[PDB]
Design a protein around this nucleic acid. Structure first.
Lengths: 177, 41, 75, 116
RNA sequence: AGCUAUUUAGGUAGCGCCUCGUGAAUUCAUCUCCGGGGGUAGAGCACUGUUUCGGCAAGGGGGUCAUCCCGACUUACCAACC
RNA sequence: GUGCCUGGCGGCCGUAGCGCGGUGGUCCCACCUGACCCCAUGCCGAACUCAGAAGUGAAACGCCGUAGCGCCGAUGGUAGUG
RNA sequence: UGGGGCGGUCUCCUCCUAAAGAGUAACGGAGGAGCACGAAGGUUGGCUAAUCCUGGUCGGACAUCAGGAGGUUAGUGCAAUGGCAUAAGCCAGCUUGACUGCGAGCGUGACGGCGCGAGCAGGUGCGAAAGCAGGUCAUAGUGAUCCGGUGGUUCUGAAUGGAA
């Protein structure tokens, strides 16, 4: 990972002066990130999930876990115990490697993107972002894909403040506004 | 890393017309060039 | 409609605390686990507390959640 | 949390032993160090507590935290178990997964002479 | 003049209750002291139900209207949840 | 003679618990680096585990204060009652 | 049956009735059962919710992600009561104890009968082992005797050897 060492050098010295952190352990470290793919159309089509599952595995570097139906909502025609959701978590070494896959060539691939809606935080330093497409990622072949499957990314860090969490996003050249 | 469920990686150099060609552990097929990237947008 | 009721199961404490009992004597017939088994006291499949040894019964309260415990002091 | 979940994971078998009146053998395992001690059936007093923090053994060790060190302490406690007069002891998991050093420590007690 | 069962319900059988005989342990009963689990009376409103008026007030309806898809104001009107 | 430290196992289960603020790192502890392989994730070294360990006391955890709550609580009166 | 014809009820389980042991009536008040599972059983190991609060591809109060509060208000094959995280709730691995012969001593019944059960012998299984397992969180899911059928067993078999 090229930006993992990039994190280990210039991000911490940047954080020590911006919030006067008197400890290197007091810095927010970027933890796991999840690529959510809650298809929702899995009410009768078993084949539809297998695509967005293998595709989500193609986007990442591992097979995602199928999220079963937790509650019983008659409005979405689901009960307890129905395979509908799909998620994969990037944590550790491959967490950094996938971050490179996005912030370098994939993030500017979003149409008319020169700044991001920065106020989409959680309140406890973790950033969330959903994309309507899949094409933006280099792994998509464009011509073999039969439907636009948008995935959702969660940036779980150990940051407690949103701007301190956004400060971590600032050290990674994030187009904000 | 649990075996058999992982797709394979490759050392893909994210090529750019400006010169932002950097290797990324990816899984597409080859190394492609494009303008709009991290430092060519 | 109604007008039907089951016949009582005759539960409760068969042998009260302070009684010298023989091994195998039934102490408490309950539905749930109102009283948990202590020392020298086994809990049946019907949650019926019986005597594993002889001795006097000692109703006590133990554990961090304050639940009743029945133990037998073989004296 | 790690510690809190471990205690709620070990309390199941520990209550079964206090009703069984067996002399237990608890094991505390940390990244840096591994402990092993014997506790009398009453529950308060301990008998033999041989651990890696005892420098009388550390001067013969390489680095407390590896398998061989676990085999070293298991030998020490099992020998001293007989040196104090403890014959049959029931091994206790203490929430730890019976795979690594704990398995190495349990083997060390068995090959030394302790019964279980 | 009870319990259980009965093509049983003013009948009958077993146990309880009575009498005679025989045989047995301070055995049984009263008060005091000690050891007990109870959850009723009372009390209370965390939980479980439910009350009232008040608030929020969704479906909004209809009009000053949009006189196209929206809906603003809205007379104020019950007032799902809390 | 002991004292302050942490960790382990109990007695006792809120006077023992939350909350706020203040401290604590040689040791202990947690966190951390790596993971071809022991082992594991119905996805991922998060957890599980091994090999180790620079760094830190932020988080966690320990301790010291604070009684804002929690919890505890007579005497007396009252409700109720044999 | 407060007289009878029209409707209900009769066996079993839960709550109240029910006056703090147990029991306890009404054509008194609320509900359910006449099965189910080869696993929803046993064991080993692991895990633990509901409900909302925030920013989020479609996606909205109402799928799915993460954080947080919260705390068992969730769940437990089924009705309600009691119970449960040491989980009995959820997931997985391995398996068949849903085992044969007995049973100290007990609770419940007039009785028939029903229920609990340490420990003992043979043998089986799970776990490293300690130990645990003779059905399932428990309380319903079921009925006497006679007559007769199927299989096994020299125990008998009316003169003896067989057979019925």
């Amino acid at each position: 990972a090229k930006l993992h060492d990039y994190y280990k050098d210039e991000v911490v010295k940047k954080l020590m002066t911006e919030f006067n952190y008197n400890s290197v352990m007091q810095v927010p470290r970027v933890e796991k990130i999840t690529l959510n793919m809650g298809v929702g159309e899995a009410i009768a089509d078993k084949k539809l999930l297998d695509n967005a599952a293998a595709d989500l595995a193609a986007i990442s570097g591992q097979k995602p876990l199928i999220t079963k139906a937790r509650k019983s909502v008659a409005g979405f025609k689901i009960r307890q115990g129905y395979p509908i959701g799909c998620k994969v978590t990037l944590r550790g070494e491959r967490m950094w490697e996938f971050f490179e896959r996005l912030i370098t060539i994939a993030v500017p691939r979003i149409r008319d993107f020169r700044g991001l809606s920065a106020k989409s935080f959680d309140g406890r330093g973790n950033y969330s972002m959903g994309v309507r497409e899949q094409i933006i990622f280099p792994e998509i072949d464009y011509d073999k894909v039969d439907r636009v499957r948008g995935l959702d990314i969660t940036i779980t860090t150990t940051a407690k403040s949103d701007e301190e969490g956004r400060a971590l996003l600032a050290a990674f050249d994030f187009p904000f506004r | 890393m649990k075996k058999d469920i992982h797709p394979k990686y490759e050392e893909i150099t994210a090529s750019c017309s400006c010169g932002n060609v950097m290797k990324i552990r990816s899984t597409v097929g080859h190394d492609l060039n494009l303008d709009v990237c991290s430092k060519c947008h | 409609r109604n007008g039907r009721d089951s016949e009582a199961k005759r539960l409760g404490v068969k042998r009260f605390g302070g009684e010298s009992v023989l091994a195998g004597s039934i102490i408490v017939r309950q539905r749930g686990t109102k009283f948990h088994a202590g020392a020298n006291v086994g809990c049946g499949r019907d949650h019926t507390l019986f005597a594993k040894a002889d001795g006097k019964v000692k109703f006590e309260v133990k554990g961090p959640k304050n639940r009743k415990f029945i133990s037998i002091e073989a004296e | 949390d790690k510690k809190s979940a471990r205690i709620r994971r070990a309390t199941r078998a520990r209550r079964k032993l206090q009703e069984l009146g067996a002399t237990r053998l608890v094991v505390h395992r940390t990244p840096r160090h591994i402990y092993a001690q014997v506790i009398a059936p009453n529950g308060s007093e301990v008998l033999v507590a041989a651990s890696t923090v005892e420098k009388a053994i550390a001067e013969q060790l390489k680095y407390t935290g590896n398998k061989d060190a676990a085999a070293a302490v298991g030998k020490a406690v099992a020998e001293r178990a007989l040196e104090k007069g403890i014959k049959d002891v029931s091994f206790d998991r203490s929430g730890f997964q019976y795979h690594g050093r704990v398995q190495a420590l349990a083997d060390a007690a068995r090959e030394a002479g302790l019964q279980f």
